[PDB]
């Protein structure tokens with residue numbers, strides 16, 4: 001996250017870190033046994049880390065649970081990033097408490113102008129590299145579809161939205177991928193792609209979760 005603030009320990013209780021020996025992507029806990037992340041974060045050998053603040057220090061609220069199954073969306077296209085969503089099942093249920101909690105799926109799609117919270121452990125610089133050890137947060141609005149399409153001609157599908165600031169300076173960045181965009185207490189987006197980080201006229205692009213609720217629910221019910 002570029003241009004954000006330190007969230008505070010366990011203030012974003014649905015945020016997970018995906019670990020394969022190191023943090024590589026975020027995700028969101030949607031019930032005690034399932035996480036949703038970006039398809040472009042797929043790999044084998046995932047451990048899900050819940051209850052994290054500092055990802056390099058054991059602070060006492062963590063739960064570390066291996067994945068048993070990963071399911072990339074049937075129509076994910078790695079060239080265009082259309083349908084950039086995946087589900088991860090945990091080998092055992094997490095223990096839910098005030099610091100480790102699920103986030104609700106939306107019943108309706110959010111409109112442009114709605115303010116959302118984006119979080120992650122990704123790079124904090126737009127030029128160069130500095131990775132934080134504690135969770136960072138950013139408040140940002142959903143942008144109109146017309147502004148999003150004007151920023152990225154030919155690249156925005158109905159399964160994407162833009163959020164952030166056209167003036168630059170505040171955005172998600174490398175290592176934030178897969179993490180949550182929460183608006184009015186519901187999961188509306190997944191950190192997906194962008195051109196650089198925090199550049200003028202190049203806002204972040206997010207997977208539009210409201211289009212996937214039926215697939216999520218049906219997949220969980222049968223796996």
Ligand SMILES: NC(=[NH2+])N1CCCCC1
Nearest residue numbers: 172173174193194197204
């Ligand atoms: N919002 C961005 N600029 N991003 C998304 C995360 C990956 C790097 C590009």
Ligand SMILES: [Ca+2]
Nearest residue numbers: 054057058059
């Ligand atoms: Ca920790």
